[PDB]
Each structure stands twice: as structure tokens, then as C-alpha cells.
Design a protein around this ligand. Structure first.
Ligand SMILES: Cc1cc2nc3c(=O)[nH]c(=O)nc-3n(C[C@H](O)[C@H](O)[C@H](O)COP(=O)(O)OP(=O)(O)OC[C@H]3O[C@@H](n4cnc5c(N)ncnc54)[C@H](O)[C@@H]3O)c2cc1C
Ligand SMILES: COc1ccc2c(c1)[nH]c1c(C)nccc12
Ligand SMILES: CCCCCCCCCCP(C)(C)=O
Ligand SMILES: CCCCCCCCCCP(C)(C)=O
Length: 513
């Protein structure tokens, strides 16, 4: 029962740390709470679905780590379907479109919406990726909620409603819940607004053939009996050179280094000895998990396609069960499906229904949105409620409430003696994602390897070579995106246009042109 390293948690972060340590000849024990690995990724297998991700599923350009780890484990990606039209459903109306963002035809709302995404990205620029609390405006921004920033930068109700939604979709909580500072950073560290929100060339570009659960399943395969299921860790005691780990059934393991590869809320439940610094205890108990119910509606035929819909719906409607959807049809066209998310407060309220009613209401929304009755005839329904997962807390990730970042934030990933911290929440690139889980996992392993004297201080943070199979097409903005003014910008200019048109009339009246 003695090891160099014990990794607490066998999600992608944990297994990445363990896989890397193992590569260096270091003995590692992964202790995993559930009867399975993979954590917030979970690929369910049955006859009705073949396979399906009920947890994390999508990968895209710039996520080079999860790509490189996926590949080398023999896992291949395929493209999310966007061949047909995306649709936006607002105010009872279905609006097909083709871009990453629903087109805005009101010229004023257009400016508003343009300036919103530009400002988010621009404000992100300011924020240090590794150290968001060091941002020039950090205290100011960290005190505001994302609702307050949205309402401050958007004049139109259209753009605020979309923004709120955008917040829901990306961090699975309500704008009023999350720090504006943390959110600007969150978006910056995923590559900006276009990158985070897009399918083509964005974070939703791709899925894994056979599911993302296979990432963890196969690292566990490599690890053999150095991974232990059903071992929830409850105590971590680093008083002596041999750190003692205790699991829920009172088994004990000893090691030299611990990697904590679970989200903060669950890190909050571990009895640490000595106690973590008060600062750190506050931070980990103050980062709540977002909320999602992921829902899979199966049909005989991908009827959305024949109406020229790809099956991606941005549903901006407060009565609506679902917020957003993608086609989830298998790469060969078999088992046509719509992956739907119920997010943020809507998840919390829909969780209160029976599954059949939740299914009923979703079919009814699909029927409406897609303008077909075939939606009311599913051959199968899968759902997974992530809030109700004791070993996850929710999905996708933790969110930072206002103030937390500036007050406790600076230690999310700081070692505590010989305890190192991983988990996607400690990542600096695609934190919140399977990508971030790998980054954090490997950097923690490197922090440990560096303790063991096997890796240099410079080598703790390694750059991922860009993926050759899924290269990052650079994100462009049109001349007009760059240069069109905000609503209030329009006004400052119009009041110039007007001033001088006016003096162009006093100069024309007095022949002084
Ligand atoms: C519905 C849903 C949709 C998502 N969408 C995507 C997506 O499309 N693409 C993407 O990249 N990401 C997505 N995410 C987020 C992504 O799944 C996570 O960011 C990533 O899986 C986090 O991995 P981790 O290893 O850091 O954490 P986890 O996967 O949470 O792993 C933690 C591990 O610790 C175990 N554990 C917990 N407590 C203990 C304990 N005390 N002792 C021992 N073990 C413990 C848990 O069982 C788990 O296996 C989604 C997540 C969900 C749930
Ligand atoms: C733009 O349409 C979508 C569809 C699914 C997701 C999306 C946007 N953003 C997501 C995120 C951030 N995670 C999981 C799924 C999606
Ligand atoms: C005085 C107002 C000038 C603003 C003009 C905005 C043009 C709206 C069309 C944008 P689309 C992305 C092609 O739908
Ligand atoms: C002041 C006159 C308005 C000029 C037209 C603005 C719309 C430009 C089309 C949109 P994009 C190509 C994506 O930036």
C-alpha cells in the first residue's frame, strides 16, 4: 500500500497525471470514488444508443492536449453536423441562419450585438491568463456580476437576452451568479467569443468516435491495477514524510506526493491534515458547480435535415425546457438524435419534474422549433442530471461568484506542502473542458516530477504543439466588426455629424465654405 504518488480522482485530469507519472517510472495510485473512471465524461453503452456521451463530448481546434491524448490512445474525432441551417428560436419564432451567431437585422441592435462580443474579447485582453486577479481592473470587475456588465454594455434588450443566454451556455449558470472578471477570463482562456461559441473552428467542432469516456477507460487500461474504483478519498494527512490517504471504507494508502484531481467543492469535503491554509479553505468551499441536464432524444430519421436544419437550435425562451442543442446522429447517419442541454436555473426547475414529463416537454419544444410533428415521436430518450452527481457537483465546471477571485482566487492551483492540485478548474487554457483537465493533470504531474528531481522548473509548463489533424484556423473579424461603433459610439459621432452639418449651414448661409 506504499506509493510515490496518490492521485485523488480518476477523471481525465487524474488519469492524465497518472499516465504521465507512470511514463517516468513513478509509482502512482489513482483512487477513484465511483465504479468507473471518466468523471464528468461518461459514455453510456446500450442497444438503443450504441454509445452516447452523457457528460463532456466536444473537442475542437486549439484543444491540442485532449487531441494529442485522444489520438495516442487510438481515438478519433468526427465533425458535429452543421451542414444544414442552424436556427434561433426567440419570441415564439424560428429563425434559420448559417453563421456562428444568430444574425441581427436591426441596425441598432446589430451595433449593440457587435459591440458586445468585441468588448467581451477586448476586456479579456487586459486579463492575465495565469493570473486573472492581477488584471489592471480586477477588483472593480470581480465585484460586478456578468449581468451588471451585460446591462452596462448592451443598450438593446435583444443583445442582453442573448448575452445572458451566452453566459448560460458557457458556464451553466445565471449572469447574476458569476463574477464578470472570472467570466471575461473564462472566455479569454478559451480563445475568445467566436472560438468558444462556434462549432466549425470552435469548441463544439468535434466529437470522439465511440465517445469521450474512452479517453479515461483506456488510460485506466494502461494503468491496470494502479487505478482503484469505489475508493472515495476522505482524509489526507501530510504530517509525516509518508502522507497517509484514507478512503471511505477506511483503507489506507501512503505516498510521498498527492495530486488532488477533483473539483473544489469535493476538495472541500476532504479532511486535510494539517488543515489547508484558511485562504485555500475559503476558496474551495466558495466555488459552486454550474448546472446541466443533458438530454438525448432519438428518432428513426434525422427529420430536421430534410427541413434543412442541422439540428442546432439556440432556444432563447424562458418557458422552454432546453437552451441549446446539437445533432447527435452517429457519424454514419445511424441513430439520429438531438443532444439537448437544460442549463442554469432552468435545469434546477426542470429537475423537479418526472423524466417522462421532462421528455414530453422537450419533444413539444422540438416540434415547435423544427416545425415538425415527427419530433413528438422519439424512439428513445436518455437523460443525465449532473447536479445530482455526488461525485461531480454539477457541470460543466465550477463558477466564480463575485469577489471570490480577488479575495481567494490567487491560490486555485498553489501546492499545499506536498499536495498538488489538478482538475480542469486549475487549468489556464480551456479550464472547464476536457482540454483543461489534461493540462492541469499533466502540469501537476510535472510539479510532482520536479519534486522528485526528474523534471526541471522550466519544464513544469510545457507548450502543446498544435494538432496536425485539427489545426486552429485563426480567428478573423471583418473590417466592420473591428470598426462599427457601439450604440453610444454612434451617438458621439451623430452629435458630431449634427454639430457640423449645422455649422455647414451657418457657413453656407454666410458664404464662408
Ligand atoms: C453534461 C456535461 C457536458 C460537458 N460538455 C463538455 C464538452 O462538450 N467538452 C469538454 O471539453 N468538456 C465538457 N464538459 C466539462 C468536462 O466534462 C470537464 O471539464 C472535464 O471532464 C473535467 O475533468 P476532471 O478530470 O478535471 O474532472 P472530473 O471529470 O470531475 O473528475 C473527477 C474525478 O474524481 C472522482 N472523485 C470525486 N470525488 C472523489 C474523491 N473524494 N475521491 C476520489 N475520487 C473522487 C469523480 O468520480 C471523477 O472521476 C462537460 C461536462 C458535463 C458534465
Ligand atoms: C452554438 O451551439 C452550441 C451547441 C452546444 C454547445 C455550445 C454551443 N457551447 C457549448 C459548451 C460551452 N459546452 C457544451 C456544449 C456547447
Ligand atoms: C446606422 C446603423 C449602421 C449599422 C448597420 C448594421 C447592418 C445590419 C446587418 C448586419 P448582418 C450580420 C449582414 O445581418
Ligand atoms: C455605415 C453603413 C453600414 C455598413 C454596413 C454594415 C454591415 C456590414 C456587413 C456585415 P460584416 C461583412 C460581417 O462586417
Amino acid at each position: 500500500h506504499m506509493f510515490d504518488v496518490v492521485v485523488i480522482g480518476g477523471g481525465i485530469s487524474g488519469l492524465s497525471a497518472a499516465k504521465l507519472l507512470t511514463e517516468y517510472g513513478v509509482s502512482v495510485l489513482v483512487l477513484e470514488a465511483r465504479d468507473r473512471v471518466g468523471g464528468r465524461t461518461y459514455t453510456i453503452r446500450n442497444e438503443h444508443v450504441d454509445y452516447v456521451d452523457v457528460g463532456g463530448a466536444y473537442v475542437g481546434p486549439t484543444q491540442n492536449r485532449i487531441l494529442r491524448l485522444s489520438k495516442e490512445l487510438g481515438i478519433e474525432t468526427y465533425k458535429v453536423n452543421v451542414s444544414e441551417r442552424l436556427v434561433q428560436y426567440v419570441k415564439g419564432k424560428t429563425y434559420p441562419f448559417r453563421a456562428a451567431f444568430p444574425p441581427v437585422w436591426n441596425p441598432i441592435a446589430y451595433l449593440d450585438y457587435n459591440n458586445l462580443w468585441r468588448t467581451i474579447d477586448n476586456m479579456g485582453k487586459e486579463i492575465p491568463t495565469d493570473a486573472p486577479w492581477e488584471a489592471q481592473h480586477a477588483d472593480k470587475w470581480d465585484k460586478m456580476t456578468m449581468k451588471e456588465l451585460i446591462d452596462k454594455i448592451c443598450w438593446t434588450k435583444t443583445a442582453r437576452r442573448f448575452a445572458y443566454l451566452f453566459v448560460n451556455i458557457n458556464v451553466t449558470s445565471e449572469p447574476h451568479e458569476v463574477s464578470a472578471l472570472w467570466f471575461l477570463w473564462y472566455v479569454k482562456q478559451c480563445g475568445g467569443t467566436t472560438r468558444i461559441f462556434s462549432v466549425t473552428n470552435g469548441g463544439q467542432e468535434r466529437k470522439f468516435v465511440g465517445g469521450s469516456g474512452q479517453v479515461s477507460e483506456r488510460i485506466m487500461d494502461l494503468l491496470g491495477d494502479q487505478v482503484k474504483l469505489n475508493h472515495p478519498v476522505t482524509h489526507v494527512d501530510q504530517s509525516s514524510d509518508n502522507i497517509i490517504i484514507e478512503t471511505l471504507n477506511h483503507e489506507h494508502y501512503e505516498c510521498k506526493y498527492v495530486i488532488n484531481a477533483i473539483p473544489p467543492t469535493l476538495t472541500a469535503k476532504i479532511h486535510f491534515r494539517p488543515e489547508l491554509p484558511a485562504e485555500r479553505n475559503q476558496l474551495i468551499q466558495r466555488l459552486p458547480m454550474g448546472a446541466v441536464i443533458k438530454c438525448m432524444m432519438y428518432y428513426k430519421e434525422a427529420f430536421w435535415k430534410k427541413k434543412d436544419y442541422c439540428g442546432c437550435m439556440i432556444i432563447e425562451d424562458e418557458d422552454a425546457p432546453i437552451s441549446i442543442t446539437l445533432d447527435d446522429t452517429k457519424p454514419d447517419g445511424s441513430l439520429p438524435a438531438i443532444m439537448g442541454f437544460i442549463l442554469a436555473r432552468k435545469a434546477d426547475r426542470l429537475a423537479k419534474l418526472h423524466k417522462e414529463i421532462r421528455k414530453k416537454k422537450i419533444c413539444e419544444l422540438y416540434a415547435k422549433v423544427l416545425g415538425s410533428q415527427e419530433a413528438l415521436h422519439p424512439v428513445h430518450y436518455e437523460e443525465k442530471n449532473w447536479c445530482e452527481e455526488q461525485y461531480s457537483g454539477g457541470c460543466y465546471t465550477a463558477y466564480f461568484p463575485p469577489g471570490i477571485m480577488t479575495q481567494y482566487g490567487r491560490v486555485i492551483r498553489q501546492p499545499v506542502g506536498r499536495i498538488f492540485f489538478a482538475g480542469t478548474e486549475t487549468a489556464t487554457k480551456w479550464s472547464g473542458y476536457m482540454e483543461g483537465a489534461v493540462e492541469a493533470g499533466e502540469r501537476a504531474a510535472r510539479e510532482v516530477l520536479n519534486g522528485l528531481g526528474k523534471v526541471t522548473e522550466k519544464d513544469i509548463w510545457v507548450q502543446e504543439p498544435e494538432s496536425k489533424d485539427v489545426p486552429a484556423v485563426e480567428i478573423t473579424h471583418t473590417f466592420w466588426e473591428r470598426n462599427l461603433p457601439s450604440v453610444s459610439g454612434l451617438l458621439k459621432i451623430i452629435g458630431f455629424s449634427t454639430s457640423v452639418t449645422a455649422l455647414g449651414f451657418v457657413l453656407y448661409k454666410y458664404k464662408l465654405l
